Design a protein around this nucleic acid. Structure first.
Ligand SMILES: [Mg+2]
Ligand SMILES: [Zn+2]
Ligand SMILES: [Zn+2]
Ligand SMILES: [Zn+2]
Ligand SMILES: [Zn+2]
Lengths: 171, 52, 93, 123, 46, 486, 81, 128, 389
RNA sequence: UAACCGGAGAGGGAACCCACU
């Protein structure tokens, strides 16, 4: 999940954006692109704490833009397959349960939810519930769920939750 | 110069086989020729005249 | 005499004679793709591959066939931007 | 019979061959001129390295290819969905993109066809 | 619509429709010619 | 396109191991059908597969999402019914065979020797030299010393393509036997014989799988709608897979072993033809078209080959060629070119606010008028042409665009005559426009050009990049190189 | 350090050609310019005026053949032209 | 690819320092404070605000000194970094629930010792 | 009631159903699919017999209701019913498939897969596949907490996979798909496929484990997933799901239909097209817009396609059709004659010339002259159109 | 009581001979 590790990413500086404040302009630029992005190796990019160093400028042969090798300490998030995290439900539907773990979106099938944990369309808020109405999972409710499969597509991380195992449900 | 249609194996048909005069040559067609080959197929011959 | 003596000393610099043949230039280990760019290609590459040969391509034509910039003058060195004179740079419009 | 009208021609980015992404030959197809071996060597002697590089790589057959940092082999890439994979590695992280001549790339497939392993590591 | 053609050795005129054998009507001669266009031609004297 | 760009440092050369070959092959279980394709659809497991690469125009590759240019090709593997060896590896194989024992597959060189230590110390990093030295010293060994067997070991020599081992009795070298003893060759034995074990192996010298390249390597072309034009590489691949299927079926059911040996010999001849069509020991293959088949060794050793006719010297655009004409009324640094050449030749220009009005003027004047442009290229890479006259919304311009504009006076061009006997034979010049259609230049430039106007035509290249134009201007220019160094 | 200056301070024709071309390139795609101009449109003339002014914001990394590199700023680089 | 228990990852991923829900909350509130100050500044990402909301609603300790006390008191004992972070995020009151949620914690410590550690965590938790 | 394949003729290597067996041991009656062109091309793919069509074409044909005789005593009923030779048919080793059954065991274990033992003294034991043989494999499994190397046949083994892994379908309707499983029952395994987040219920025998995910392209290599094609020349559609012989396609109005592989044709996509969403800000492909009006009001997604007033949108949170919903653009918010005609240059420097217009512009035109071996440019104001058609 | 839709990449190749530099 949340890990405080240094990252290195190459930044391309457009020559028309040299200006007086080279370092400040490059730092503001880097805070623009690197935040909010995702990658397969490191997951979601949450926050960048410090810029560790700024490398020497190298002019590419035949290309105007100059490249600065910049390393920086940052905070990243990476969910683990086969690992349980508490979650908050976004929406409950005919097709399944939709929930959010921070920025990461997880989906639960009705074959992943317990069979007793069954949906009531007659209820005005869409919610899963039991026969005895003891466990009721509503939208924006703190639940726990076992993540069983993680996959990434177009630099977007989303997961599938599992609740056949015991001690899984609303917190 | 010569337009031909070749039937291939919706609203689309035989392909184009159009033999052109070569690029960057100008002038006038002086005379043309239609005959048959030894096979029996039609056979055309077009001469291009160009004053220099 | 500069070029003539340079030719002769590059001929004799390996401790022995160097006739300009495949029979010598294959024996000097001066780059497998130099050897391939010589008149014999498949045998010298095939022996380099058979013996497991490493090459950092410090040549010229190897850089050329890889398509990148050959470090043989006008491209041998690197260019570094100066942020101090860049911040001395006045705006233009 | 040597007429200037019959002899003059010029080309600006016409067709490309099926086997290699290179210009045509002969002015009938608006052919391209062969920037030959000894001309390349004499350009080297002049020292116009950037001019020779642009004449030899991107004005003829520029390409981009992915190679992983573990083993110097070709890796496949579905760039529409941005899934980059090296078989035999399953890494998909220690990978890089390089600019590659089309002819030398086809040379690399010929090498592996002759069971040559041009292990081409990025670093 | 049919083409106006010239036999050559007969120096005669005939009418030819498409996808027909290229033969003269009275002699069947294979060497066969087409007439000048009706579209106008001019030439400056240079 | 998320991968960062990198500059290159090093290359390693080895042999491909068969397990890695069948791993990175996209074909699973190989291909085992001698048909090229099905009657109606492309076929999977035939000679051509969509898994190998994109097949037709406006189509998609099965493995990757690329198309023609964006599809870089995919490979395959064919498991052989019998292992087989080929030339080059055959010669190195028989060298290693004379180095190694026959029965116990021991080192036979007795590496615990001061001579062996001296050879290693001298050839610290010289594998072929080490191999030659150890083969020369180990040629005179005969019996084993270590090696348990007391036999004299057979002399192994080639008869045409096949190899025979004769004891002080002659037998055929079975490829299975050669593969077995190369497998029994130890790793330390391989290292002390002096060839790198991690990248190559003696049992990798023998191969049991055929790597098959994609349709980029073997193109399929259509002519007059027939689409039957397939290359000799595809034909020989079909022959290889047909014979491999025949051998596999025969070893599955018949196993009379005489047809097996004879068909294995023909399959070995076929893969030897795949390596090189021309062999001193066996006749070349034959096609019904009457032409000899073209092998890859020929395809690279030729003067039109990849290494020379496609790598050292390759076809380039941006290069006119025409006959010349003396003209003394212009300076020594200037060359006059025809209007048609100047109109059919382009030059790239950056749109800057300093000249944005003049570039806009040139753009809406456009192609087919002499001062004009034919292509406009945006910042994102959108290429818009001017010859089909797009809408004025497209004709509107902003700073930073790419203009393929016709050149005017002052631009720098390079200019030569083949053969370039001397380095003075290609000079930079400033372009200028004259009405009649030929190159116009100076006699002071003819004198180094070896040019004498009896029908000799010159070539004219124009660089596109501005820095290349500047460096040509400042290095190869006639006043800057008035005087030769030689 | 300022003492280990093995290569000559005379900057070469190759160096001046490369810096002139690249300077003309960012002048062409409109990076800010700090030499005063008398009114010119072409980046070639702007770049040669910069080169004769000797005020380029670029320092050259020369690769000495041992493996080490040395930096040479254009201000302390004496021009052969 | 990697499971939570067997936990294979590179040495950079191992030396990556984990963060609490409350630690992420205080760091992200700090960074949001510098984002709010120094105007004419580009705002932070919607991912940053979603993470801030999630870690604010899942924060366990509202005091930085309390956070440091929890981290030191779970630090002197021998536990894995990932299991330590998971235990700090979950805060289970029962060792049975803790070992059911984390299978890698089974056999790492004694049952009564783990229950005592969880009880200490519950006592030193900041309750609202 | 058996199956054979013919040896000679145009019907070589085709499945034929032996219906009646004559006791004379000379010929047997076969029901077979005719590979005929109904006397149209000859003066051939398999297709159903068309008695009405062959009666309309005429020729050698005899009509007897459902029974018919054509083209050299070829007998058909309702399906050819013709006698064929015992030596010309092959009665052993045919094994028709399910498609041939509709018209008229196996073991596949691969190394790297996990299989479990469900019977014997070694019950419920999961181990990795190392080798495979024909019927009795005698496998070498890598069991958990067991370094000893056991032996098991394919009949004893069952392809059991752990929860949450990439699984592949070797054959069937769902073949070529990759996904993550949901719940493993005793025979039914349910998975969400990766390219189409869709529920597939497949058997463990049909399941397979591999590391290469779905490529997202059809079997023919022509159309990818989430693609744009032409249902008909007025309405375009988006292939949202690939199927073994078909495509599930969302239409222009939000209806999901199923079309054939060859029914739709690919259309060129304008990647630089522009659209307006009634609030006057430009929107393009791969742009995030919120749908605030219409049937999908209150939603948000990325633009996949643009039509001149319409937009095709992708949402991951919508599990239906891969989030693919289509709506009009106006309910979204951001988050010549002179060609080929003889003309005369009758005023100016080229006065009195006759030319042919090859290109015409808004202001000028190109004229290829008839006298000078040269083509020039001349203004439409100075142009004059004499002659023509 | 109804309203501004637009469309351009190419297709072999391989050999021999001649001519020119
Ligand atoms: Mg001459
Ligand atoms: Zn790899
Ligand atoms: Zn007649
Ligand atoms: Zn491909
Ligand atoms: Zn021995």
């Amino acid at each position: 999940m949340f890990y405080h590790i240094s990252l290195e990413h190459e930044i391309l500086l457009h020559p028309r954006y040299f200006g007086p404040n080279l370092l400040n302009t490059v730092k503001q630029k880097l805070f623009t692109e690197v935040e909010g992005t995702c990658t397969g190796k490191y997951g979601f990019v949450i926050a960048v704490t410090t810029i560790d160093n700024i490398g020497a400028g190298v002019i590419q042969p035949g290309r105007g833009f100059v490249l600065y090798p910049v390393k920086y300490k940052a905070i990243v998030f990476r969910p683990f397959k086969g690992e349980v995290v508490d979650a908050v439900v976004t929406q409950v539907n005919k097709v399944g349960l939709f929930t959010e773990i921070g920025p990461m979106s997880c989906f639960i099938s009705r074959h992943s939810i317990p069979s007793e944990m069954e949906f009531d369309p007659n209820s005005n808020p869409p919610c899963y519930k039991t026969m005895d109405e003891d466990i009721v999972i509503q939208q924006d409710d703190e639940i726990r769920l076992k993540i069983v499969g993680t996959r990434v597509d177009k630099n977007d991380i989303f997961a599938i939750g599992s609740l056949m195992d015991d001690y899984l449900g609303l917190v | 110069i010569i337009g031909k249609t070749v039937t291939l194996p919706r609203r689309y048909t035989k392909r184009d086989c159009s033999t052109f005069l070569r690029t960057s040559e100008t002038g006038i067609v002086d005379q043309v020729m239609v005959t048959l080959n030894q096979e029996g197929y039609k056979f055309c011959k077009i001469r291009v005249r160009s004053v220099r | 005499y500069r070029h003539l003596a340079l030719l002769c000393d590059t001929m004799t610099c390996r401790g022995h004679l160097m006739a300009i043949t495949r029979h010598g230039v294959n024996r000097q280990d001066t780059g497998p793709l130099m050897k391939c760019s010589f008149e014999e290609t498949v045998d010298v590459l095939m022996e380099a591959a058979a013996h497991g040969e490493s090459d950092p391509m410090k040549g010229v034509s190897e850089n050329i066939m890889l398509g990148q910039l050959a470090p043989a003058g006008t491209g041998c060195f690197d260019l570094l931007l100066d942020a101090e004179k860049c911040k001395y740079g006045m705006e233009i419009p | 019979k040597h007429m200037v009208d019959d002899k003059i021609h010029s080309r600006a980015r016409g067709p490309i061959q099926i086997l290699n992404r290179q210009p045509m030959e002969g002015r009938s197809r608006d052919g391209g001129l062969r920037f030959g071996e000894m001309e390349r060597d004499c350009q080297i002697a002049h020292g116009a390295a950037q001019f020779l590089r642009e004449r030899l790589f991107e004005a003829s057959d520029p390409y981009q290819v992915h190679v992983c940092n573990l083993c110097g082999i070709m890796a496949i890439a579905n760039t529409r969905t941005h899934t980059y994979e090296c078989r035999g590695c399953r890494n998909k992280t220690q990978i890089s993109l390089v600019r590659m001549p089309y002819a030398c790339k086809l040379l690399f497939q010929e090498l592996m066809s002759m069971s040559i392993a041009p292990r081409m590591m990025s670093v | 619509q049919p083409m106006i053609y010239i036999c050559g050795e007969c120096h005669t005129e005939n009418e030819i429709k498409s996808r027909d054998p290229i033969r003269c009507r009275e002699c069947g001669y294979r060497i066969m010619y087409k007439k000048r266009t009706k579209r106008l031609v001019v030439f400056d004297a240079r | 396109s998320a991968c960062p760009l990198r500059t290159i440092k090093r290359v390693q050369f080895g042999v491909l191991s068969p397990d890695e070959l069948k791993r990175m092959s996209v074909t699973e279980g190989g291909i085992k059908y001698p048909e090229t394709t099905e009657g109606g659809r492309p076929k999977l497991g035939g000679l051509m597969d969509p898994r190998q690469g994109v097949i037709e125009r406006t189509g998609r590759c099965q493995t990757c999402a690329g198309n023609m240019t964006e599809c870089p090709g995919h490979f395959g593997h064919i498991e052989l019914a019998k292992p087989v060896f080929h030339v080059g590896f055959l010669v190195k194989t028989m060298k290693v065979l004379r180095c190694v024992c026959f029965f116990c597959s021991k080192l036979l060189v007795d590496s615990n020797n001061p001579k062996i230590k001296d050879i290693l110390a001298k050839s610290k990093g010289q594998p072929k030299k080490r191999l030659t030295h150890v083969y020369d010293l180990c040629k005179g060994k005969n019996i084993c010393e270590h090696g348990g067997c007391g036999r004299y070991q057979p002399r192994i020599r080639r008869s045409g393509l096949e190899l025979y081992a004769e004891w002080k009795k002659k037998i055929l070298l079975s490829p299975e036997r050669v593969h077995e003893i190369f497998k029994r060759i130890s790793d330390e034995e391989c290292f002390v014989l002096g060839m790198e074990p991690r990248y190559a192996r003696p049992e990798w010298m023998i191969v049991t799988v055929l790597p098959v390249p994609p349709l980029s390597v073997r193109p399929a072309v259509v002519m007059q709608g027939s689409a039957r034009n397939q290359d000799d590489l595809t034909h020989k691949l079909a022959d290889i897979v047909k014979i491999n299927n025949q051998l596999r079926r025969n070893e599955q059911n018949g196993a009379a072993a005489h047809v097996i040996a004879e068909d294995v010999k023909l399959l070995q001849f076929h893969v030897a033809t795949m390596v090189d069509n021309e062999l001193p020991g066996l006749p070349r293959a034959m096609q019904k078209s009457g032409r000899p088949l073209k092998s890859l060794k020929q395809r690279l050793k030729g003067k039109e080959g990849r290494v020379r006719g496609n790598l050292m010297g390759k076809r380039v655009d941006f290069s006119a060629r025409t006959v010349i004409t003396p003209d003394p009324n212009l300076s020594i640094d200037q060359v006059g070119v025809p209007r048609s050449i100047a109109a059919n030749m382009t030059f790239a220009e950056i749109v800057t606010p300093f000249n944005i009005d003049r570039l806009q003027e040139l753009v809406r004047r456009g192609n087919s008028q002499y001062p004009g442009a034919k292509y406009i290229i945006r910042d994102n890479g959108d290429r818009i042409d001017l010859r089909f006259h797009p809408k004025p919304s497209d004709l509107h311009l902003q700073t930073g665009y790419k203009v393929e504009r016709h050149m005017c006076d002052g631009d720098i061009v390079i200019f030569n005559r083949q053969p370039t006997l001397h380095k003075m034979s290609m000079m930079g010049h400033r372009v200028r426009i004259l009405p009649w259609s030929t190159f116009r230049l100076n006699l002071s430039v003819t004198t180094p050009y070896n040019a004498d106007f009896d029908g000799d035509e010159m070539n004219l290249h124009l660089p596109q990049s501005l820095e290349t134009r500047a460096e040509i201007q400042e290095l190869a220019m006639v006043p800057r190189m008035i005087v030769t160094p030689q | 350090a300022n003492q280990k200056r093995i290569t000559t301070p005379y900057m070469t024709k190759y160096e001046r050609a490369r810096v002139l071309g690249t300077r003309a390139l960012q002048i062409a795609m409109c990076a800010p310019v700090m030499v005063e101009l008398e009114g010119e449109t072409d980046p070639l003339l702007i770049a040669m005026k910069e080169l004769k002014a000797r005020k380029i914001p670029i320092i050259i990394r020369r690769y000495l053949p041992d493996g080490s590199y040395e930096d040479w700023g254009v201000d302390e680089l004496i021009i052969s032209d | 690819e990697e499971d939570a228990s067997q936990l294979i990852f590179p040495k950079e991923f191992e030396t990556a320092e984990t963060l609490l829900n409350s630690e992420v909350h205080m760091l992200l509130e700090h960074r949001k404070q510098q984002n709010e100050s120094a105007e004419d500044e580009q705002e932070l990402s919607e991912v940053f605000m979603k993470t801030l909301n999630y870690t604010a609603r899942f924060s366990r300790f509202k005091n930085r000194e309390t956070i440091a006390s929890v981290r030191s008191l779970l630090l002197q004992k021998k536990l894995h970094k990932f299991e330590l972070a998971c235990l700090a995020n979950l805060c289970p009151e029962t060792a049975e629930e803790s070992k059911a949620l984390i299978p890698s914690l089974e056999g790492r410590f004694e049952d009564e010792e783990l229950q005592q550690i969880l009880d200490d965590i519950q006592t030193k938790r900041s309750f609202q | 009631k058996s199956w054979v394949r013919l040896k000679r003729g145009i019907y070589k290597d085709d499945i034929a159903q032996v219906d009646y067996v004559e006791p004379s041991q000379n010929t047997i009656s076969l029901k077979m699919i005719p590979r005929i062109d109904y006397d149209r091309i000859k003066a051939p793919p398999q297709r159903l017999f068309d008695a009405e069509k062959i009666r309309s074409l005429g020729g050698d044909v005899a009509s007897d209701g459902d029974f018919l005789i054509f083209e050299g005593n070829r007998y058909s009923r309702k399906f050819l019913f013709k006698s064929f030779a015992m030596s010309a048919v092959i009665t052993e080793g045919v094994k028709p498939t399910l498609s041939e059954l509709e018209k008229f065991r196996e073991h596949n274990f691969q190394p790297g897969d996990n299989v479990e033992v469900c019977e014997g003294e070694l019950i419920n034991l999961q181990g990795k596949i190392l080798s495979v043989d024909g019927n009795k494999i005698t496998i070498m499994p890598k069991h958990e907490d067991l370094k000893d190397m056991l032996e098991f046949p394919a009949q004893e083994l069952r392809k059991y996979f752990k929860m949450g892994d990439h699984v592949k379908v070797i054959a069937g309707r769902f073949e070529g798909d990759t996904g993550l499983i949901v719940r493993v029952e005793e025979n039914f395994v349910i998975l969400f496929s990766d390219l189409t987040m869709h529920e597939l219920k497949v058997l463990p025998r049909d399941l397979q484990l591999c590391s290469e995910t779905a490529s997202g392209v059809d079997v023919g290599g022509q159309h990818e997933w989430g693609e744009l094609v032409q249902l008909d020349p007025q309405t375009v559609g988006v292939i949202v799901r690939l199927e073994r012989e078909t495509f599930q396609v969302l239409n222009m109005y939000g209806k999901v239909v199923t079309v054939r592989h060859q029914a739709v044709t690919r259309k060129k996509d304008n990647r630089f097209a522009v659209a307006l969403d009634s609030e006057q800000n430009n929107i393009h492909v791969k742009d995030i817009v919120k749908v605030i009006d219409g049937p999908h009001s209150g939603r948000e997604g990325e633009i996949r396609h643009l039509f001149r007033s319409f937009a095709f949108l992708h949402c991951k949170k919508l599990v239906e059709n891969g989030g693919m919903f289509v709506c009009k653009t106006r309910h979204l918010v951001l988050a010549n004659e002179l060609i080929g005609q003889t003309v005369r240059i009758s005023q100016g420097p080229y006065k009195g010339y006759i030319g042919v217009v090859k290109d015409a512009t808004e202001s000028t035109a190109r004229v290829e002259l008839h006298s000078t071996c040269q083509t020039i440019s001349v203004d439409r104001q100075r142009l004059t159109t004499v002659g023509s058609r």
